[PDB]
Structure formats: C-alpha cells, structure tokens
Amino acid sequence: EHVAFGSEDIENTLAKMDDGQLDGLAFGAIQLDGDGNILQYNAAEGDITGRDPKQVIGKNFFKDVAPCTDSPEFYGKFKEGVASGNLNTMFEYTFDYQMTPTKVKVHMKKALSGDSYWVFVKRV
Ligand SMILES: *C(=O)/C=C/c1ccc(O)cc1
C-alpha cells in the first residue's frame, strides 16, 4: 500500500513487494547483500541519482556505484549493522558522484530475507 519513509516496520511491508510495487514507493529503495552488492534498486532511487535501475543490479554499491558513501559515516555504519545483526540507522548525507550534489536522508535497515539489507533514500 502506501508506506512512509522511516516507518517502524518498513521491512515487513517491503518484504511483500514486487519490482513494480517497489518502483511505486515515494522514496528510493536499494537492497544490498552483506558485501554491498546491489540486489534491488527502485525507480524512485534512479530518479534521484540518474542511475538506470536495470543496469546497477549486481554492481557493488560502495566500490563502484556510490564511492562517496565509502566512509565511516555511511559504509562504516552499514558494516557495523551487518555484523551486529541489528541494522537500523538514519542519518543525512550528500550524494555527489556523477550527479548534481544532492542532500538526502538515508535509512538503512536489515531485511527479513536472508543476507539482505535495505538502504532507503529521500531528498531533503
Ligand atoms: C556518492 O558517490 C553517492 C552516489 C550514489 C548514491 C546512491 C545511489 O543510488 C547511486 C549513487
């Protein structure tokens, strides 16, 4: 249905969704495996970043797609949460690789499905 950015049970709602449904979200949604490889990437995210969602699948988010996020402030928090098993964290960030510098709010949250982690993004 409608689901809001930052919802307490967002991972429950998104677990139920196909590509088209993920594409209809109000916010960018990326699913990563524990190594940061991109499993899913929705249309809303591509509208923020200019990436083609169909072609970033399989790439590594931190190494290749989003090098500006390779930092203790973003990637560091991702890996801490993958390790702890309790990934659920929110912060502001600026995305600026091969796009106009864009201020965003990011929410990372463990998925219900195996070896899966969400990165949610909205403009601020
Ligand atoms: C910094 O390099 C961020 C880049 C970026 C963030 C999010 C995406 O979906 C794509 C590229």
> What separation in angstroms does the CA of 32 have from each of 1, 57, 75, 117, 120?
23, 10, 12, 5, 11
How far lies 7's CA from each of 43, 63, 74, 95, in Å?
A: 20, 29, 20, 23
Does residue 23 contact residue 3 with C-beta atoms inside 8 Å? no
Mutate to test the pocket of ligand 1, among 32, 69, 91 (most ligand atoms within 8 A of CB): 69
Domains of the chain, residue spans = 1-124
3-state SS of 22-42 is HHCCCCEEEEECCCCEEEEEC
Say how many Å lie between the CA of residue 97 and the centre of ligand 1.
6
Residue entry with tokens 């402030």: 73
3-state SS record for the chain: CCCCCCCCCHHHHHHCCCHHHHHCCCCEEEEECCCCEEEEECHHHHHHHCCCHHHHCCCEHHHHHCHHHCCHHHHHHHHHHHHHCCCEEEEEEEECCCCCCEEEEEEEEECCCCCCEEEEEEEC
Residue 9, sorted as left (phi over 0), alpha (psi -120 to 50) or beta, turns out to be alpha
Calculate ∠ Cα 26-29-33, nearest 5°.
165
What's the resolution in A? 1.3
Total residues found in the chain within this entry: 124
CA nearest to 61, candidates 106, 10, 16: 106
Cα(118) to centroid of ligand 1, in Å? 14
CATH of range 1-124; options 3.90.180.10, 3.30.450.20, 2.102.10.10, 3.40.50.300: 3.30.450.20
40 vs 22, 55, 72, CA distance in Å?
Answer: 9, 10, 23
User: Cα Rg for the chain, rounded, in angstroms?
Assistant: 13
Experimental method: X-ray
Whole-angstrom distance, CA of residue 4 vs CA of residue 104? 15
